[PDB]
Amino acid sequence: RWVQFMKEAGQGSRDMWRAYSDMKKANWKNSDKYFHARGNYDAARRGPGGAWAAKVISDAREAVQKFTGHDSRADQFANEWGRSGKDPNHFRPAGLPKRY
Amino acid sequence: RWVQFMKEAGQGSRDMWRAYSDMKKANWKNSDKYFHARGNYDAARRGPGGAWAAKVISDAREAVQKFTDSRADQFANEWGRSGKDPNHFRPAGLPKRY
Amino acid sequence: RWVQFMKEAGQGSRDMWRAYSDMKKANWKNSDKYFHARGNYDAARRGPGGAWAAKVISDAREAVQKFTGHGDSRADQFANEWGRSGKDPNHFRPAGLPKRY
Numbered sequence: 668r669w670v671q672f673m674k675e676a677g678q679g680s681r682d683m684w685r686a687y688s689d690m691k692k693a694n695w696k697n698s699d700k701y702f703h704a705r706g707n708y709d710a711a712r713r714g715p716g717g718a719w720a721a722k723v724i725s726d727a728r729e730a731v732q733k734f735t736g737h738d739s740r741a742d743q744f745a746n747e748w749g750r751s752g753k754d755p756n757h758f759r760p761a762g763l764p765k766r767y
Numbered sequence: 768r769w770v771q772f773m774k775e776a777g778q779g780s781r782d783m784w785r786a787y788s789d790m791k792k793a794n795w796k797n798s799d800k801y802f803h804a805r806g807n808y809d810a811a812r813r814g815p816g817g818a819w820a821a822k823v824i825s826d827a828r829e830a831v832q833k834f835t836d837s838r839a840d841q842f843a844n845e846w847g848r849s850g851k852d853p854n855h856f857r858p859a860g861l862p863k864r865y
Numbered sequence: 866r867w868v869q870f871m872k873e874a875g876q877g878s879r880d881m882w883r884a885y886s887d888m889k890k891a892n893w894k895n896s897d898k899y900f901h902a903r904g905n906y907d908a909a910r911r912g913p914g915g916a917w918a919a920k921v922i923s924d925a926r927e928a929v930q931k932f933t934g935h936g937d938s939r940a941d942q943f944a945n946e947w948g949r950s951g952k953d954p955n956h957f958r959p960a961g962l963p964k965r966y
């Protein structure tokens with residue numbers, strides 16, 4: 668039912684949060700696009716609910732970015748890259764620890 | 768904050784539902800696109816969270832439609848959401864409260 | 866702490882899934898308002914993250930009702946809010962509902 672979709676959305680949201688926290692924790696220059704792609708990739712592979720959550724969260728982030736001044740297209744490109752099932756590692760900065 | 772964002776989202780959502788409510792309350796001559804634009808326009812006026820909310824609701828609506836046209840609604844949605852005037856789609860003599 | 870909020874939200878989500886699951890198993894007449902109320906009650910008790918998760922889930926449910934048929938919604942939301950505010954879910958308990966629920 669809609670329950671299963673929502674559970675996937677819930678999982679997808681956590682994948683999104685996981686990507687965000689791992690990115691602060693890593694504090695690695697030019698890592699953002701990797702984590703954006705990775706969070707959307709992980710989330711979408713939870714199923715339709717996860718892919719929906721990743722999009723909704725990504726657009727919420729874009730909206731806040733716009734409001735505060737900037738970039739955004741590049742981020743959304745990385746977002747959609749991972750969400751479509753493409754490898755986030757194409758954005759992986761050299762030396763990024765294997766645990767991320 | 769994101770408390771502020773979420774507030775705007777709540778308000779924007781209400782503007783949306785209120786748009787959809789009004790529309791049923793008016794079984795109309797070709798009234799669709801006006802209500803869709805107005806909801807988004809109202810919702811976007813609340814701020815970023817409202818614009819964001821209007822978009823998730825619009826896209827969701829469209830998604831459910833995809834088992835039952837959709838693009839023309841989406842044009843009207845983005846019209847209002849961008850701030851362009853919803854009355855552009857007003858039908859012939861639509862009651863004043865809408 | 867975002868971590869704590871996220872932890873409460875996860876718990877509250879589980880409380881919500883547990884209510885819906887319990888509702889299904891029980892298959893008891895006139896019982897949805899109880900489970901709607903109970904899920905929000907248990908969720909809100911987790912902390913702000915839980916109350917928030919329960920609202921997001923309740924509002925998403927209402928949204929899907931409206932797009933399709935399920936639409937009554939106001940009555941469901943009244944129960945949701947009732948439980949989420951901390952009021953007794955048993956206010957909606959139908960006669961005979963097994964005690965474990």
Ligand SMILES: CC1=C(/C=C/C(C)=C/C=C/C(C)=C/CO)C(C)(C)CCC1
Pocket residue numbers: 719776777780820823824827830831920921922924925926928929
């Ligand atoms: C009020 C409001 C919401 C309602 C969302 C909807 C409409 C959820 C249903 C989605 C479905 C079924 C999508 C199918 O692709 C939530 C709380 C989520 C966030 C802010 C806007």
